[PDB]
């Protein structure tokens, strides 16, 4: 599987886009097998809305569109498992 790699990105910063065009930038703290991720000290930006900083946010996996990971991530080393 591949979701195990997603659960290893705790405490790192990424930018996830949602199926409704919403963007969310924050630090990861925990992920599940259903792709649901919990981000702490996060900032959300709904479509045609103003950004808001949230100290926590638990998101479901179905409504996720894609993620944006850092530039220095070790893919070759992190994909070994």
């Amino acid at each position: 599987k591949l979701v195990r790699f997603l659960m290893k990105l705790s405490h790192e910063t990424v930018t996830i886009e949602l199926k409704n065009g919403t963007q969310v930038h924050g630090t990861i703290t925990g992920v599940d097998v259903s792709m649901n991720t919990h981000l702490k000290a996060v900032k959300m930006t709904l479509k045609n809305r103003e950004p808001v900083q949230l100290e926590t946010l638990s998101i479901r996996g179905n409504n996720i569109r894609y993620f944006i990971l850092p530039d220095s991530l070790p893919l070759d080393t992190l994909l070994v498992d």
Partner: protein, 86 residues
């Protein structure tokens, strides 16, 4: 899975796929993410088609609500739980 256990009974705001925001007392959950909210109120953002007016908010009281996880996008803590102390 303490990430979710730690938040039981807190006043969390659930984000719906249609853009609504359900703010209620998060009571319990499950593997499917089906939540139970107490004293929930529904908000929705309506676009102004008349002129450049402030976004229109239409509150709606519901009480006890059961949200299906499939329809839940995300959830955050709006504020601490209702304090029972004077």
């Amino acid at each position: 899975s303490s990430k979710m256990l730690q938040h039981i009974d807190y006043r969390m705001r659930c984000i719906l796929q249609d853009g609504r925001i359900f703010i209620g007392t998060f009571k319990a959950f499950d593997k499917h993410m089906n939540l139970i909210l107490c004293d929930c109120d529904e908000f929705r953002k309506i676009k102004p088609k008349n002129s450049k007016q402030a976004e229109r908010e239409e509150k709606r009281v519901l009480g006890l609500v059961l949200l299906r996880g499939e329809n839940l996008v995300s959830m955050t803590v709006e504020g601490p739980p209702p304090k029972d102390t004077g």
